[PDB]
Amino acid sequence: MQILLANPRGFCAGVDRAISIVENALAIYGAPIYVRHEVVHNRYVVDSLRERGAIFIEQISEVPDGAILIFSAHGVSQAVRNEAKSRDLTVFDATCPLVTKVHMEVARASRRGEESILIGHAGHPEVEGTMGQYSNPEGGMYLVESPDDVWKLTVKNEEKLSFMTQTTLSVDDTSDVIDALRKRFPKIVGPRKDDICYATTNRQEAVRALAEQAEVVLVVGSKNSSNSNRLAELAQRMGKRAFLIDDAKDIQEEWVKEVKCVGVTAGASAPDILVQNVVARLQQLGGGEAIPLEGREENIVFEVPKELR
Ligand SMILES: O=P(O)(O)OP(=O)(O)OCc1ccccn1
Ligand code: F3S
- Domain CATH for 41: 3.40.50.11270
CA distance 192 to 173: 16
Q: Identify the domain boundary among 196, 213, 228.
A: 196
List the catalytic residues. Answer: 126
Domain that holds residue 144: 97-196
Whether ligand 1 lies within 6 angstroms of the CB of 125 is answered as: no
Please indicate, yes or no, whether residues 118 and 84 belong to a single structural domain of this protein. Answer: no
Q: Whose CA is nearest to atom 13 of ligand 1?
A: 74
- Ligand 1 nearest atom to the CA of residue 224, by list position: 3
Q: Whose CA is nearest to atom 4 of ligand 1?
A: 226
Q: How many CB atoms lie within 10 A of CB 288?
A: 10
Please indicate, yes or no, whether residues 142 and 168 belong to a single structural domain of this protein. Answer: yes
Please indicate, yes or no, whether residues 206 and 287 belong to a single structural domain of this protein. Answer: yes
Non-local (6+) Cβ contacts of 106 within 8 A are 116, 118, 130, 131, 133, 134, 141, 164
Q: Identify the domain boundary among 176, 196, 216.
A: 196
Do the beta carbons of residue 104 and residue 77 sit within 8 Å? no
CA distance 228 to 235: 11
Please indicate, yes or no, whether residues 39 and 69 belong to a single structural domain of this protein. Answer: yes
Whether ligand 2 lies within 6 angstroms of the CB of 73 is answered as: yes
Do the beta carbons of residue 27 and residue 52 sit within 8 Å? no
Residue of 38, 76, 101, 126 to mutate, ligand 1, most atoms within 8 A of C-beta: 126
Please indicate, yes or no, whether residues 111 and 88 belong to a single structural domain of this protein. Answer: no
Q: How many CB atoms lie within 10 A of CB 8?
A: 22
Give 78: exposed, middle or buried? Use CB within 10 Å, 0-12, 13-18, 19+.
middle
228 Cα: distance to centroid of ligand 1 (angstroms): 8
Whether ligand 2 lies within 6 angstroms of the CB of 197 is answered as: yes
CA distance 14 to 98: 8
Whether ligand 2 lies within 6 angstroms of the CB of 91 is answered as: no
Non-local (6+) Cβ contacts of 212 within 8 A are 238
What is the distance between the terminal CA atoms of the chain, rounded to a whole angstrom?
45
Instruction: Determine if residue 258 is left, alpha or beta; phi over 0 gives left, psi from -120 to 50 gives alpha, anything else beta.
Output: left
Do the beta carbons of residue 207 and residue 8 sit within 8 Å? no
Number of domains making up the chain: 3
Whether ligand 1 lies within 6 angstroms of the CB of 15 is answered as: yes
Q: How many CB atoms lie within 10 A of CB 283?
A: 14
- Ligand 2 nearest atom to the CA of residue 97, by list position: 2
Do the beta carbons of residue 80 and residue 57 sit within 8 Å? no
Please indicate, yes or no, whether residues 207 and 289 belong to a single structural domain of this protein. Answer: yes
Whether ligand 2 lies within 6 angstroms of the CB of 15 is answered as: yes
Residue 102 to residues 73, 119, 259, Cα–Cα distance (Å): 13, 12, 42
Whether ligand 2 lies within 6 angstroms of the CB of 304 is answered as: no
Q: Which ligand is nearest to the CA of 267?
A: 1
Q: Whose CA is nearest to atom 7 of ligand 2?
A: 14
Phi, psi of 190 (to 5 degrees): -155, -165
Please indicate, yes or no, whether residues 218 and 170 belong to a single structural domain of this protein. Answer: no
CA distance 158 to 140: 11
100 Cα: distance to centroid of ligand 1 (angstroms): 13
Please indicate, yes or no, whether residues 21 and 77 belong to a single structural domain of this protein. Answer: yes
Please indicate, yes or no, whether residues 261 and 202 belong to a single structural domain of this protein. Answer: yes
Q: Identify the domain boundary among 134, 169, 196.
A: 196
Method used experimentally: X-ray
Please indicate, yes or no, whether residues 207 and 170 belong to a single structural domain of this protein. Answer: no
Preceding omega of 125 cis (within 30 degrees of 0): no
The pairs formed by 122-129 with CB atoms below 8 angstroms and a separation of 24 or more are 124/74, 124/166, 124/226, 125/37, 125/72, 125/74, 125/75, 126/74, 126/75, 126/99, 126/166, 126/167, 126/168, 126/226, 127/166, 128/77, 129/74, 129/75, 129/76, 129/77, 129/80, 129/95, 129/99, 129/103
Whether ligand 1 lies within 6 angstroms of the CB of 228 is answered as: yes
Please indicate, yes or no, whether residues 120 and 210 belong to a single structural domain of this protein. Answer: no
Residue 117 to residues 113, 136, 166, 168, 296, Cα–Cα distance (Å): 13, 14, 11, 16, 31
Q: How many CB atoms lie within 10 A of CB 176?
A: 12
Q: Whose CA is nearest to atom 2 of ligand 2?
A: 14
CA distance 80 to 291: 45
Q: Whose CA is nearest to atom 6 of ligand 2?
A: 197
Please indicate, yes or no, whether residues 68 and 134 belong to a single structural domain of this protein. Answer: no
State the CATH number of the domain containing residue 231. 3.40.1010.20
CA distance 285 to 72: 37
CA distance 256 to 109: 50
Give 86: exposed, middle or buried? Use CB within 10 Å, 0-12, 13-18, 19+.
exposed
